[PDB]
Design a protein around this ligand. Structure first.
Ligand SMILES: *[C@@H]1O[C@H](CO)[C@@H](O)[C@H](O)[C@H]1NC(C)=O
Ligand SMILES: *[C@@H]1O[C@H](CO)[C@@H](O)[C@H](O)[C@H]1NC(C)=O
Lengths: 39, 23
């Protein structure tokens, strides 16, 4: 059997934040990752 | 006319080709 090997999904994690002056709420961007791989 | 997985990522540009076309 021939099997393709695709490297396991990886990418940077960025934190979208307003200033700590404004709020402690943050969003998180998993770069180039489908919303299924993210835990 | 104008024509990988080792820790190498390509970030998409902030302005899509559609937005540059609108500009
Ligand atoms: C940011 O928070 C500090 C608290 O040490 C406050 O003194 C300052 O006025 C705040 N700045 C703004 C722009 O809200
Ligand atoms: C994410 O995965 C689903 C199935 O697991 C697929 O239908 C969808 O096209 C994928 N989207 C991206 C952006 O990879």
């Amino acid at each position: 059997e021939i099997l393709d090997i695709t490297p396991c999904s990886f990418g940077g994690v960025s934190v979208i934040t307003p200033g700590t002056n404004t709020s402690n709420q943050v969003a998180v961007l998993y770069q180039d990752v489908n919303c299924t791989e993210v835990p | 006319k104008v024509t990988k997985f080792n820790g190498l990522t390509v970030l998409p540009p902030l302005l899509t080709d559609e937005m540059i076309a609108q500009y």
